[PDB]
Amino acid sequence: GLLYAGFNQDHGCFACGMENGFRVYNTDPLKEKEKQEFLEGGVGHVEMLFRCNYLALVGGGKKKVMIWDDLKKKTVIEIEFSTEVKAVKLRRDRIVVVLDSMIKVFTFTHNPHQLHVFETCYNPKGLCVLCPNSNNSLLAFPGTHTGHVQLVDLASTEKPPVDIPAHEGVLSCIALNLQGTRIATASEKGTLIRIFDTSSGHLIQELRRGSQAANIYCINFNQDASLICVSSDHGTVHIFAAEDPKSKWSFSKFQCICAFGTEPNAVIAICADGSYYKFLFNPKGECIRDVYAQFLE
Amino acid sequence: EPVVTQLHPGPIVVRDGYFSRP
């Protein structure tokens, strides 16, 4: 009955959308925090805000967004749209709603109102990243020119946007590091992962997954953005050295969304079929399976 | 034109550390 799963902003937690509601977990160690069997229509998307009491929920038909106060156990805000809502991103002062062709920014008050609209290319995957840091309101998304990422500063919206020619074809994945300073992107060819500085838009690192094609599902940095982990559509997760001088291949591999765990040599993986894996690795790339659990039960 | 609907009077107040670590 699982419809969606995503990590929160520091990957300390993940949240799942169910046909019968939603669930919130602590990532490492795997501990279920809350469950809400109450929504009959289910939720297709769930966004957290670190470990705060609010979640953003995408309704049954994905037409309405619901702001859920879990300390009050109630929807306190509802925003209805005339298009499918593909994704929602939160920071302390902003609610960002991703439609398949545009992104719409609202205040985060008891009665939100619209602030900005941003045209995107066709964005059925709802790709978007939003830094939540107090000193960095970076918002990034697929530009109208296919394969380019547009970077906007929500604290300084009068500027012109930075435009990164990340790929020549359709983007498939975009991730942001914890410091808001690096973005990693991949296209549907999935052959190169490319990491860019967010204030200048210039290439920092390019990694090779393989000459062959495999569809990226998720990318994530570790705490200091010295490693990244990547999951592929044939039950495959690679990790990479992110600040190595030259262009490099995968440090390590193992056999879905993925993030680094509590310990700096730990990696977590959560699968659409209900599986949860924790793996441990070595400076040289040995990958040990540590935990397997069916986290839905 | 999206339709915003408010369903609770008081302000929004971010309570960090709600989903505490085990």
Residue numbers in the entry:
A (entry chain A): 9 to 263, 270 to 311
B (entry chain B): 1378 to 1399
Quote the paper.
Fortunately, a loop-deletion mutant of WIPI3 (referred to as WIPI3-Δloop), with deletions of two flexible loops (Blade 2 B–C loop (75–80) and Blade 6 C–D loop (264–281)), shows enhanced protein sample quality and has been crystallized for structural determination. We then adopted the fusion strategy by which the WIR-peptide is fused to either the N-terminus or C-terminus of WIPI3-Δloop to stabilize the complex or facilitate crystallization. After extensive trials, the crystals of WIPI3-Δloop with N-terminal fusion of the WIR-peptide were obtained for structural determination. The complex structure was determined by the molecular replacement method and refined to 2.2 Å. The WIR-peptide of ATG2A was resolved (from 1378 to 1399) based on its electron density map. In the complex structure, WIPI3-Δloop adopts a seven-bladed β-propeller fold and each blade contains four anti-parallel β-strands (from A to D). The β-propeller resembles a disk-like structure with a narrower top and a wider bottom from the side view and the WIR-peptide forms a linear structure and tightly entwines around the β-propeller from the rim to bottom. The interaction interface between the WIR-peptide and WIPI3 can be divided into three sites (namely N-site, M-site, and C-site, from the N-terminus to C-terminus of the WIR-peptide). In N-site, the N-terminal part of the WIR-peptide forms a short β-strand to augment the β-strand D of blade 2 with specific hydrogen bonds between their backbones; P1379 and V1381 from the WIR-peptide make hydrophobic contacts with F98 and I96 from blade 2 and F123 and P129 from blade 3; the sidechain of Q1383 forms an additional hydrogen bond with the sidechain of H127. In M-site, I1389 and V1391 from the middle segment of the WIR-peptide insert into the hydrophobic pocket formed by I94, V93, I84, Y65, and L60 from blade 2 and L107 and F125 from blade 3; the backbones of V1390 and R1392 from the WIR-peptide form hydrogen bonds with the sidechains of Y65 and N64 from blade 2, respectively; D1393 from the WIR-peptide forms an electrostatic interaction with R109 from blade 3.
PROPPIN (β-propellers that bind polyphosphoinositides) proteins are phosphoinositide effectors that play prominent roles in autophagosome biogenesis. PROPPINs adopt a seven-bladed β-propeller fold, in which the two neighboring sites in blades 5–6 contribute to the binding of phosphoinositides. PROPPINs can also function as scaffolds to integrate the phosphoinositide signaling with other regulators for controlling autophagy. In this study, we determine the structure of WIPI3 in complex with the WIR-peptide from ATG2A.
